[PDB]
Amino acid sequence: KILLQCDNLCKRYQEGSVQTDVLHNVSFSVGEGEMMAIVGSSGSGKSTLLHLLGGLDTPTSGDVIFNGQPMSKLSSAAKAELRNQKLGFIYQFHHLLPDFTALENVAMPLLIGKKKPAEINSRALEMLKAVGLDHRANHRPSELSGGERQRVAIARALVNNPRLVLADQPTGNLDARNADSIFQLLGELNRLQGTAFLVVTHDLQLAKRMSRQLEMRDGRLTAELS
Amino acid sequence: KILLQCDNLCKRYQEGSVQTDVLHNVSFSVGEGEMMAIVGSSGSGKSTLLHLLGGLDTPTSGDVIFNGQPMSKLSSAAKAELRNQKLGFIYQFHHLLPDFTALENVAMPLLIGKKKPAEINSRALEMLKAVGLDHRANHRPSELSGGERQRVAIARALVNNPRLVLADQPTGNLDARNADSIFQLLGELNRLQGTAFLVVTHDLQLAKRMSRQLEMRDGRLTAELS
Amino acid sequence: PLSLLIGLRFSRGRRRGGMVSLISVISTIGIALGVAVLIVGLSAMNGFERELNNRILAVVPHGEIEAVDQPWTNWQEALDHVQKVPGIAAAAPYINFTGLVESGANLRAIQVKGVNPQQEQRLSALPSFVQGDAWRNFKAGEQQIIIGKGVADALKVKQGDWVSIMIPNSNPEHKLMQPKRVRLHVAGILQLSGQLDHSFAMIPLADAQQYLDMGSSVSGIALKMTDVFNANKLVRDAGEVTNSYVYIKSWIGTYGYMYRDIQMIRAIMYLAMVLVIGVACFNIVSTLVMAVKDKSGDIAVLRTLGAKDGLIRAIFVWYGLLAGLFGSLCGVIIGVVVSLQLTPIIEWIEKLIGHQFLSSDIYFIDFLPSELHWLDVFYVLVTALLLSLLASWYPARRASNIDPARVLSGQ
Amino acid sequence: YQPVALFIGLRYMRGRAADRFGRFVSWLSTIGITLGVMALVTVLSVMNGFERELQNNILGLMPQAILSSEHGSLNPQQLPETAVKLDGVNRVAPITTGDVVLQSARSVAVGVMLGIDPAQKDPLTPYLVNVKQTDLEPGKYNVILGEQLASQLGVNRGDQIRVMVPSASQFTPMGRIPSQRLFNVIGTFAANSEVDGYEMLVNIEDASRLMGNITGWRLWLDEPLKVDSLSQQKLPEGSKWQDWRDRKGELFQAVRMEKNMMGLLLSLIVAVAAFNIITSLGLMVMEKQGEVAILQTQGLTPRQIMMVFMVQGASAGIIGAILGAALGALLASQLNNLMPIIGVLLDGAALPVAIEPLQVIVIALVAMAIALLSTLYPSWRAAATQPAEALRY
Ligand SMILES: Nc1ncnc2c1ncn2[C@@H]1O[C@H](COP(=O)(O)OP(=O)(O)OP(=O)(O)O)[C@@H](O)[C@H]1O
Ligand SMILES: Nc1ncnc2c1ncn2[C@@H]1O[C@H](COP(=O)(O)OP(=O)(O)OP(=O)(O)O)[C@@H](O)[C@H]1O
Ligand SMILES: [Mg+2]
Ligand SMILES: [Mg+2]
Structure with a gap:
């Protein structure tokens, strides 16, 4: 079965008289519990595609179907719920709230989901230990390093046990060992919770661990090349 | 040879009467034209050390001497001159002025240096083309991508032909091809003008192209372990 | 210049911004509003x-010197002995008494003041431009004389009607006797106001000498000065040369309660003006502080590239001038227009609202009078420009003195 | 949470x-x-x-409002004290007001007459000094004056004052003699207000007027600045309605x-x-x-x-x-x-x-x-x- 489908997805940018288009009828489908890599060149259009599939932007030339529900014909009272439980998102620059601690940052989607308290701390600490951040659970994002500021976002995406995780470069600020550990964690999560992963990566080595690879040369999702 | 020398400097943090020590007696030295790599695990303290060497933070112990002049005891005008004419810096998160264009961002160090406007635009355009960003000179940082923003920061660092470049993960958000091209450009710059490149990198195979490969762990600069 | 370029880019920074950003328009209409309310308050x-000055101080005379109830004609030097103290604009000898006016069984008590033939209008502005009546042509003869319009309540008279006059004896002895009740011809009516022009009449000093018995003695003196609220000092000072008995009361002494009320009113108005100045200057400094606090990150980035503190100072004084000059100019343009030609009568009902806020409460007209000075406007502009420069300067240097790595990280 | x-x-x-x-x-x-x-x-x-x-300091001694009735020396027989129905009314008492010229042994001044019953309490009562509001018998023509006025015309306890009423004048083809009376001051009176300059009080029952005198009605106001809305009132022919704005008009x-x-x-x-x-x-x-x-x-x-x-x-x-x-x-x-505010104004x-x-x-x-x-x-x-x-x- 399929989980997230997009077809004829075109996005163009126009602020002044100058036009700049980034996508050319991108069409692909992701099934449940599926590894996937969207490795590609810089400036190709990987991040904007991820924004479009997540419902955080308007494609204006197509539609994205999530679990049979198109994203355009969705009320704000329903988009929020989908975005809170069914889908998790990791930004490329790991946008964190710079007034909460790391523990509160990881536990924020659990608070938003109206979960009953006194185990929110347990799940947040479990995820912070899983990404390897037990000793930095009281530091604000301003007091965190760039490498471990990314792990907070990674844990925040995975703390709610979603169905599909859209990761935008979850590796670029990490070393090889931490990247390997986090990819093992993602594989373990797929094995147990069955969560599909759509990861945009620049590291070609760990991209081979992904079940499927795409290219996105110049805004078109080609099958495979280099 | 020598150009920059660290005299047993160490850094601690007081996060509200709580001590979290981050550095332990760093006493390494670098010559002129020596391309250096620092490698370490995430959260070890590479970026704090790089900030300390550039004069952007207080060492709270020891001192950093630039070819005979300590950075602790220096006039504000002299510090600004040093930072503008003979020291380039690449931030890990490429802080660029958001209201200016890419060309204006790259040309900004030349404008502060009081150069002739005829050559400023030519030099900025040449440096923008060097990182392969010719087709985005009119784009604001909000209209650029992660890789393009990183390349703009790299071009801004090298646009003034400094004697020493402090790079903090210059190829974090780049693919393999662009990272290889950037490192090649760094090599050509080192061979032509003789500028030392103190680069912090998370990539191991790309760090093998350096003269010395110091590994920094737990606030200490080990000779070589991994 | 580079600093002006950076300041203008900061002004128009938000997105494309069209012409200017949200921070710019919010920071430039606070200055306009402050300047407008300042000049409106000063004009009011x-x-x-x-x-x-026109309705109270000019109406009543200041100071006196009384006689010793004896024939005292040696007063011609008084007009030469009032210029010893500077500030005495004019002086005029005068006489006062009381009487009755009869016209159709409408007797009314009237105090009557005798004035100098030539100094009746230079001494004070009261009997000068009331109605342009048949004054300044009385002479010693032609005893027809002027009275206020408000005295004709039960009396129906005009410029030529005849009335009766009752006078007392006022002999120079220990006590008083029966009144003489010597009648006289009086004709002529003026109009000044409704408060003083109720039971007040006016007589010459020339015709007061005959049918009287003090031997052409002018008992009282009159004075006018500039320091009206300080006038107690100069009245005593000018009375150094006088007869054996001298009284040094003035408008302050005679009308102490009215003077106290006037001083209280002035103090309250000055307190309210100080409050307006304090409030209308806070929204100027506060809004410009937030802009620089927002731009602190770009200040750090500029300091990283090697921008001297002089460059940042120039950038932010240009920023303050751009946010201040346009705002102050718009402020004076709107304020001078709304103060010189105030919105006369369009105040009845405001725009339709879902819930009326405190309807049928106390409603007051804003201001009938407003004077254009064209000098306090310059002071308001100077203080607005100075405050705009000062507000966008201290946070600039405060952010410039921090290490770039700390502030750029978000600390 | x-x-x-x-x-x-x-x-x-x-x-x-x-x-x-x-x-x-x-x-x-x-x-x-x-x-x-x-x-x-x-x-x-x-x-x-x-x-x-x-x-308080101004209108707590002078009449804030008063009606007029001069025909027949009118008593409440035409209308009791409950005749007034205007809003802002808190208390009504009898009064008699009019300009009167006071002649002393050495000086002549002017004032306004006040009619206060000895039994009735007036707002000026607590400011009486050395006197206990007595001696105001209807039979006796005793006069109450003001401290400022008494110092002004030079009259103390044990003196006599001639009283003339210009308003109540009998026009006849001999002379122009107005109402004339002789009053005795048997007390010392004072008040710390501007009204002390010309205040003077007597009993309501007196022959000061022509006819045996007019009888006004002092009308206290809950809002003494409401007087601009004194339009709604009723009065008989030959009289009118008056306000405190007749005096101190420039003050208003x-x-x-x-x-x-x-x-x-x-x-x-x-x-x-x-x-x-x-x-x-x-x-x-x-x-x-x-x-x-x-x-x-x-x-x-x-x-x-x-x-x-x-x-x-x-x-x-x-x-x-x-x-x-x-x-x-x-x-x-x-x-x-x-x-x-250190720079306070003088007084x-x-x-x-x-x-x-x-x-x-x-x-x-x-x-x-x-x-x-x-x-x-x-x-x-x-x-x-x-x-x-x-x-x-
Ligand atoms: N106020 C603070 N400022 C900076 N680092 C702090 C502060 N308080 C605690 N720390 C910790 O000190 C360490 C300093 O690490 P640093 O910021 O130099 O990054 P790093 O080791 O180069 O990491 P990476 O390259 O993976 O981002 C981090 O573990 C950080 O969480
Ligand atoms: N608002 C915009 N106006 C114009 N061009 C834009 C706009 N937003 C994005 N672009 C351009 O469209 C392309 C899409 O960038 P995108 O962020 O998808 O790249 P990327 O592959 O994720 O980058 P990187 O390698 O830096 O991570 C880029 O070339 C970018 O410059
Ligand atoms: Mg991207
Ligand atoms: Mg770092």
Whole structure:
């Protein structure tokens, strides 16, 4: 079965008289519990595609179907719920709230989901230990390093046990060992919770661990090349 | 040879009467034209050390001497001159002025240096083309991508032909091809003008192209372990 | 220049911004509003201050010197002995008494003041431009004389009607006797106001000498000065040369309660003006502080590239001038228009609202008088420009003195 | 905790700070609200204090209003004391007023007659000195004068005063003799007011008038400045209705002008203060447009974002209003003892009341409502932008 489908997805940018288009009828489908890599060149259009599939932007030339529900014909009272439980998102620059601690940052989607308290701390600490951040659970994002500021976002995406995780470069600020550990964690999560992963990566080595690879040369999702 | 020398400097943090020590007696030295790599695990303290060497933070112990002049005891005008004419810096998160264009961002160090406007635009355009960003000179940082923003920061660092470049993960958000091209450009710059490149990198195979490969762990600069 | 370029880019920074950003328009209409309310308040204060001088101080005379109830003709040097103290604009000998006016069984008590033939209008502005009546042509003969319009309540008279006059003896002895009740011809009516022009009449000093018995002695003196609220000092000072008995009361002494009320009113108005100045200057400094606090990150980035503190100072004084000059100019443009030609009568009902806020409460007209000074406007512009420069300067240097790595990280 | 909106709103206040100046930028809105509220309450207190002080000290001795009846020496037989039905009436007592010329052994002056029953208590009673309001027998023609007047014309205890009534004059074809009487002063009287200059009192029953005298009716006013609305009244032929504005007319004009100017200055203060609250909170909402993008990414309903920003606005406004009310009350109560306005005018003082229930309460509530309403639109505008669009900056 399929989980997230997009077809004829075109996005163009126009602020002044100058036009700049980034996508050319991108069409692909992701099934449940599926590894996937969207490795590609810089400036190709990987991040904007991820924004479009997540419902955080308007494609204006197509539609994205999530679990049979198109994203355009969705009320704000329903988009929020989908975005809170069914889908998790990791930004490329790991946008964190710079007034909460790391523990509160990881536990924020659990608070938003109206979960009953006194185990929110347990799940947040479990995820912070899983990404390897037990000793930095009281530091604000301003007091965190760039490498471990990314792990907070990674844990925040995975703390709610979603169905599909859209990761935008979850590796670029990490070393090889931490990247390997986090990819093992993602594989373990797929094995147990069955969560599909759509990861945009620049590291070609760990991209081979992904079940499927795409290219996105110049805004078109080609099958495979280099 | 020598150009920059660290005299047993160490850094601690007081996060509200709580001590979290981050550095332990760093006493390494670098010559002129020596391309250096620092490698370490995430959260070890590479970026704090790089900030300390550039004069952007207080060492709270020891001192950093630039070819005979300590950075602790220096006039504000002299510090600004040093930072503008003979020291380039690449931030890990490429802080660029958001209201200016890419060309204006790259040309900004030349404008502060009081150069002739005829050559400023030519030099900025040449440096923008060097990182392969010719087709985005009119784009604001909000209209650029992660890789393009990183390349703009790299071009801004090298646009003034400094004697020493402090790079903090210059190829974090780049693919393999662009990272290889950037490192090649760094090599050509080192061979032509003789500028030392103190680069912090998370990539191991790309760090093998350096003269010395110091590994920094737990606030200490080990000779070589991994 | 580079600093002006950076300041203008900061002004138009938000997105494309069209012409200017949200921070720019919010920071430039606060200055305009402050300047407008400042000049409006100062114009209203000047308009009220003119009213007190015209309607209260000019109406009543200041100071006196009384006689020893004996024939005292040696007073011709008084007009030469009032210029010893500077500030005495004019002086005029005068006489006062009381009487009755009869016209159709409408007797009314009237105090009557005798004035100098030539100094009746230079001494004070009261009997000068009331109605342009048949004054300044009385002579010693032609005893027809002027009275206020408000005295003709039960009396129906005009410029030529005849009335009766009752006078007392006022002999120079220990006590008083029966009144003489010597009648006289009086004709002529003026109009000044409704408060003083109720039971007040006017007589010459020339015709007061005959049918009287003090031997052409002018008992009282009159004075006018500039320091009206300080006038107690100069009245005593000018009375150094006098007869054996001298009284040094003035408008302050005779009307102490009215003077106290006037001083209280002035103090309250000055307190309210100080409050307006304090409030209308806070929204200027506060809004410009937030802009620089927002731009602190770009200040750090500029300091990283090697920008000297002089460059940042120039950038932010240009930023303050751009946010201040346009705002102050718009402020004076709107304020001078709304103060010189105030919105006369369009105040009845405001725009339709879902819930009316405190309807049928106390409603007051804003201001009838307003004086254009064209000098306090310059002071308001100077203080607005100075405050705009000062507000966008201290946070600039405060952010410039921090290490770039700390502030750029978000600390 | 469970109310996530309240938690985020409380955490948005009490920011990172870590500096003396860092707290100032976060507390700018609270400081502005406090300044506006304090200025409003202290200026209202000063205004009300002046109005009350002038009202008491001037119109607590002179008749605020009186009717007229001169036909037949009218008694309440035509209409009892309950004849007046106008609003703002609190008490009515008999009175008799008119201009009278007083001749002494050495001087002649003028005054106004006051008719006060010995049994009836008048507002001028407590200021009597050395006398106990006695000797005002109907049979005796005893005269009460004023201290200022008595010093002015030189009359003390044990003297005689000739009384002439110009209004009550019998016109005949011999002379022009008005009503003439001889009164004896058998007491010392005083009052600390302007009215002491010409106050003088007698019994109502006297033959001072032609006919055996006119009988007015003193009418106390709950609002002595309401007199502009004295149009609704009834009176018989040959008489009229009178107000306190017949005397001190320039005082009434000055009071009206001062009230108008104070109202204008109040409007200016409100206009400046309301603008500062509206813009500062809107800019605080607009500045954190990236935070709401992250919250919407995590799954926050726009209603929840509106609640977050409304909670922050309320938390700022309540503290600002309370601090402003406290500071304004303290400044009003200490405008003279502390002497903050050192450059005080000569013989000039400011009198406050700082009345609580109707002045310092509604202002704070209006300020809090303005703080609430200023936040709603910017939060709605920020919640409409796409999360990936706002986060690009
Ligand atoms: N106020 C603070 N400023 C900076 N680092 C702090 C502070 N308080 C605690 N720390 C911790 O000190 C360490 C310093 O690490 P640093 O910021 O230099 O990054 P790093 O080791 O180069 O990491 P990476 O390259 O993976 O981002 C981190 O673990 C950080 O969480
Ligand atoms: N608002 C915009 N106006 C114009 N061009 C834009 C706009 N937003 C994005 N672009 C361009 O469209 C392309 C899409 O960039 P995108 O962020 O998808 O790249 P990327 O592959 O993720 O980058 P990186 O390698 O830096 O991570 C880029 O070339 C970018 O410059
Ligand atoms: Mg991207
Ligand atoms: Mg780092």
